[PDB]
From a paper:
The C2 symmetry axes of 12 copies of the SP2 dimer and the C3 axes of 8 copies of a C3-symmetric homotrimer were aligned with the C2 and C3 axes of an octahedron. We sampled rotations and translations along these axes to generate a closely packed octahedral model with the C2 dimers on the edges and the C3 trimers on the vertices. Interface residues were redesigned to create binding surfaces between the SP2 dimers and the trimers. Twenty-one designs were experimentally characterized, and one was found to assemble into octahedral structures by negative-stain EM. In this nanocage, the SP2-like component shares 87% sequence identity with the original SP2 design and its absorbance spectrum had a red-shifted shoulder in the Qy region, similar to the original SP2−ZnPPaM complex. The cryo-EM structure of the 600-kDa octahedral nanocage with 24 ZnPPaM molecules bound to it was solved to 6.5 Å resolution, with the helices well resolved. The asymmetric unit of the cryo-EM structure agrees with the design model to 3.4 Å backbone r.m.s.d.
For Chl dimer protein scaffolds, we chose hyperstable C2-symmetric repeat protein dimers containing symmetric pockets with tunable sizes and geometries. In this dimeric repeat protein architecture, the hydrophobic core is independent of the small molecule-binding site, enabling full customization for binding with little impact on the overall protein structure. We describe de novo-designed proteins that hold Chl dimers in precisely defined, closely juxtaposed geometries.
Author numbering:
A (entry chain Y): 1 to 337
B (entry chain R), D (entry chain 1): 1 to 234
C (entry chain K): 169 to 337
E (entry chain Q): 1 to 168
The structure:
């Protein structure tokens, strides 16, 4: 299956090269197929994807880099050129020239680790410019110059945590994000992001114990406890939307416990109650629509057709609302499963 | 003996080969028996004389039941239930032949009844073939066939039941052969033995094991005694 | 109408066993589903669980009863028989899987019905468009309401399937 | 088994008691068998279960041969040679019964052939009873009877010979029953199976053991196949 | 709970017998209830279902087989007759007479294993005729003659795999 996989990956390499604008990489891919090198085939494929993402970005440096990588069959250099073209797109979205230099350098050195570092650092710089976190942008630039994918991902997660904190108003979460960016702990930054989200949910609902647990997790850096607090906050929000204060209290107890399984189970029970309520409401809306239809049938007119169409639209809107509730419940089950 | 009563098995094999011209399962069973007969004769020629005797005794019952099945097929070429039970006994015989070939002990267990099964099967087949316009008990014979099918299911509760069914068929087959060569003294004599036969069959269908078997056997004996005179009445 | 379930509930109340009382409740629910469907083996397993006090077996019997009810609503007697076998086994995972398969079949059926209803509504709309009048607007609005009701029914079936998945997950 | 296939022996005893109304030697043998049946049932009720099974197996062959003798007497009430051979088989059966009662081992040795002897005897008796004006082979059947008497003397040289004689009688008894219910298609069909039967008998009287037995068995099978249609020809 | 389960399964047996067209199996079921044999009750029930599936298929052989199984109370023979009536329906959908012979033989021998073998072999023959897999139909016929439920299910799954392959 080696020669067959080689011919297939090399045909895909030639196709993505012609789509990238590379007939030379297409011919090198045809050669990788004729030789039967699945490594060289996947190399020409990743280099062709790199050239496509570069033509999307606009850097001839990584373009010629992927061209040479396909002509030689360098899989590491091709993956580096692909991640570096992704970094170049993310930087053109952000606007950091040192990031572009680091990405081109990762593509030239063929360091796919440094290339993913440049991608995560361009994402971190974009997220920092969107949030306004100068420590996050500084950590992103430092990771791009260093080529540390962990540090760049930490800067990205810290910029995201700072954004979630500024949107929530959680200066403890913003401080935890800055501390994680300075530490380069992507785990702590993700915990700060989850804690800022949980605090936002607590503020939107009114669960001060939930916001307190979120701040405590942000100070601690427990992404598991922060995610459990966010799940319990969403469950208590669904409870307030339904009217189950006992569910909100159980969610508070579970968030204080730090587990998300009980929070998800409570959210599921609240979603089941809300779904029964929405089913009753939808049955009532369908009965009302059928009644308006029978009324328009018995005496059709401007007002009759108006009421029938209005009832049909109301039933459609109620069905859309019930489907949105079901989608929220399913998203909760997915985040839990 | 193991080679002096296998010439009788050889005449049985010659009869069955000439009496099983259809049902290629019957020809295949006859071939497996002849190979089993060949295997026993080789063991009879080998030092495996006790194994030869055992295989020859098994193949003797095999050839007997195969002749029963061939005579049934010759006497039940028009009964779908009979052909179905015949193919079923053929499959059971192939299974028992594979089991005995595996040294299974349980060979003369189901085939012990499958021998009696083929006996009663050929019995009902002859009862149907020597019948004519008025069967008058082919339903009962089908009931017996059902009871045979039930015996086909009652195979442990069929050892004496198979014998009783065969004896009732013999009382019927005697009456059937008497009415066959009759145009009515033989018919009236068989109408009285058939009366006791049906009475015992209802008793045999009433859970009577010794009394009903005795009544059916006596009815069959009286029918055979009247058949001695009915055979000279034409 | 399960006096065995009522007796098990009274016995659990006298014993103070909330587990036995919940098992009696689940068994009474399974027996209610069996009576509403007609699964006497399911009602028998429910009474046996009520006499035993197995909330797990009673919940599995209730899941199998709901699955067999969905099967009868769809027409899968093999599904009802598999539900009976699983309830006799006492596990609810197979009962939930069978209920999911029955809900998938019913969902394909409801999707075909909803596509037909949407085609009929579009046809009534084209008819009201070609010649609008009292009868034309009446038929168009009636087809729109029928499509809305069919969508509501399909959404109710999907909601029942999702509730089954939730009770299983 | 020793008490589950002895109910079949009990039905056999009931048949023979109702089918042996003459030849007080037959009634005495039936009584000795019932006592032997009683002795086995007591051993079946005692801890002598293997002895019960052995005595029951012996008494089963005894009752089978006794039924053969009773059916012969019912079918040979006019043949002096048949009655003589029947009384001779009765004396031999009393001797074998005394020997088995003495634990003699050699019980299923002469009675092993005396069972086949009673088989062929009832066979010739039925061939004579189902005969009519034109026997056309009763001389041969008497020759066979002579060959049976010779088998009565050849009892070691009669194990396969008794089987061959029984098969030739069956080819004759099939033809006899066909001509009995016939007034001539069945007669012409039996005239061709009887031709091969007489050819094999001359071959069987020519020292041909496998070929003549095969030819007679095939003739009997063809006769039974034609009898399937002859049974519906009336 | 033995006598109660017996009376219930035997009442269901009599009902499915009357629905199958068997008042004799209905009376045998009433007798199984009066005696209190849950085994004989479920036997008459499976035999009544067998007779119903046979009346749906149209084989009086398995019909009388289930009738006798209910009159006696044979659970294995009743389950064999039921799976064999399913096999007969699947064969009438397929059209294999050797499969019908094997199914009737499994019903008569009472081999519920051979009866499920005949059912899976009739399904295998149908799936092979739908796919066009002669090896699958040959394996199905071989399993029906042998009575191997594993081999018949394998022939069915192989015919389905060949169908999925031809469609793919």
């Amino acid at each position: 299956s080696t020669k067959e996989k080689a011919r297939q990956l090399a045909e895909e390499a030639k196709e993505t090269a012609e789509k990238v604008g590379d007939p030379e990489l297409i011919k090198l891919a045809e050669q990788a197929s004729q030789e039967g090198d699945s490594e060289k085939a996947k190399a020409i494929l990743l280099a062709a994807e790199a050239a496509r993402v570069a033509k999307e970005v606009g850097a001839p440096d990584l373009i010629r880099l992927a061209r040479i990588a396909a002509r030689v069959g360098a899989s590491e250099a091709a993956k580096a050129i692909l991640l570096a073209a992704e970094a170049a797109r993310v930087a053109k979205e952000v606007g950091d020239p040192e990031l572009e230099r680091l990405a081109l350098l990762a593509a030239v050195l063929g360091d796919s680790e440094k290339a993913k570092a440049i991608l995560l650092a361009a994402e971190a710089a974009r997220v920092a410019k969107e949030v306004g976190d100068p420590e996050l942008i500084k950590l992103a630039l430092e990771a791009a110059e260093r080529g540390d994918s962990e540090k760049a991902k930490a800067i990205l997660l810290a910029a995201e945590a700072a954004r979630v904190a500024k949107e929530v108003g959680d200066p403890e979460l913003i401080k935890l994000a800055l501390e994680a960016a300075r530490r380069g702990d992507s785990e702590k930054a993700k915990a700060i992001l989850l804690a800022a989200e949980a605090a936002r949910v607590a503020k939107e609902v009114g669960d001060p114990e939930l916001i307190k647990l979120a701040l405590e997790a942000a100070r601690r850096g427990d992404s598991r406890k922060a995610e459990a607090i966010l799940l319990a906050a969403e469950a208590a929000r669904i409870a307030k939307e339904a009217g189950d204060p006992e569910a909100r209290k159980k969610a508070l107890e579970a968030a204080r416990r730090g587990d998300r399984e009980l929070a998800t189970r409570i959210l599921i029970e609240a979603l089941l109650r809300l779904l029964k309520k929405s089913t009753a409401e939808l049955k009532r809306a369908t009965a009302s629509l059928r009644a308006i239809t029978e009324e328009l049938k018995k005496n059709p007119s401007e007002d009759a057709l108006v009421e029938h169409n209005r009832a049909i639209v109301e039933h459609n809107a109620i069905i859309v609302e019930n489907n949105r509730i079901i989608a929220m419940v399913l998203e909760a089950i997915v985040r839990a499963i | 003996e193991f080679k002096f009563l296998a010439t009788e098995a050889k005449m049985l094999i010659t009869a069955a080969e000439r009496l099983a011209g259809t049902d290629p399962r019957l020809q295949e069973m006859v071939a497996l028996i002849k190979k089993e007969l060949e295997q026993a004769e080789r063991t009879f020629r080998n030092g495996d004389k006790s194994e030869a005797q055992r295989q020859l005794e098994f193949v003797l019952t095999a050839a007997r039941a195969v002749m029963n099945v061939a005579a049934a097929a010759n006497a039940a070429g028009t009964d779908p239930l009979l052909k179905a039970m015949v193919d079923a006994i053929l499959w059971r015989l192939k299974e028992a032949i594979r089991t005995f070939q595996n040294g299974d002990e349980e060979a003369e267990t189901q085939l012990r009844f499958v021998l009696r099964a083929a006996i009663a099967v050929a019995v009902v087949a002859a009862a149907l073939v020597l019948a004519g316009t008025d069967p008058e008990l082919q339903e009962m014979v089908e009931q017996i066939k059902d009871l045979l099918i039930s015996a086909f299911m009652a195979g442990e509760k069929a050892l004496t039941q198979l014998l009783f069914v065969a004896w009732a068929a013999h009382a019927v087959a005697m009456i059937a052969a008497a009415a066959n060569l009759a145009g009515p003294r033989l018919q009236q004599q068989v109408k009285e033995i058939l009366e006791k036969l049906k009475e015992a069959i209802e008793t045999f269908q009433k859970g009577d094991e010794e009394q009903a078997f005795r009544q059916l056997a006596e009815v069959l004996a009286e029918a055979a005694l009247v058949a001695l005179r009915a055979a000279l009445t034409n």
